[PDB]
Design a binder for this molecule. Structure first.
Ligand SMILES: NC(=O)[C@H]1CC(=O)N(Cc2cccc3c2OCC3)C1
Ligand SMILES: [Zn+2]
Length: 140
């Protein structure tokens, strides 16, 4: 589990969104595994606006933050899971690292701020849904 809290927005994995998230919906995209809802309180996270390929992510199944090198956001085939059939997921970045299903939502960050959140895993790989292209998270 886990979310990004930036301005009056809550960014979560679409497959983990709650009823309250759907009832306060701002934007959702199944192909990216992302959903954004509105919040009453202002958040403290800042979004990275960069092309970094190194950062650090939080892994709840190890209670640890790991430094990783990660690929550029792209269209990657993801195996079938409890939440989606086998399909191509867009704006996804892969790294070598530990990830179990419940690790989804952990933040990946670089020197500029939050890059994305854990969305996929298995086989000693971890995949992150990029949010650096969602410029509207910084305003309104
Ligand atoms: N974005 C998606 O399609 C995710 C939905 C889901 O439940 N996925 C399975 C998964 C996530 C994280 C780590 C691991 C996984 O499987 C093995 C370890 C992929
Ligand atoms: Zn950066």
């Amino acid at each position: 589990s886990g979310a990004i809290y930036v301005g009056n927005y809550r960014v979560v994995n679409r497959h983990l969104a709650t009823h309250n998230d759907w009832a306060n919906l701002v934007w959702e995209d199944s192909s990216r595994d992302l959903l954004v809802s509105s919040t009453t309180a202002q958040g403290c996270d800042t979004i990275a606006r960069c092309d970094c390929q190194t950062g650090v992510y939080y892994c709840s199944s190890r209670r640890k933050h790991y430094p990783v090198s990660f690929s550029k956001p792209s269209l990657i085939f993801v195996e079938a899971s409890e939440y989606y059939p086998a399909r191509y997921q867009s704006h996804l970045m892969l790294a070598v690292g530990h990830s179990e299903p419940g690790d989804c939502g952990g933040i990946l960050r670089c020197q500029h701020g939050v890059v994305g959140i854990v969305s996929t895993g298995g086989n000693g790989l971890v995949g992150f849904a990029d949010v650096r292209d969602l410029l509207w998270l910084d305003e309104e």
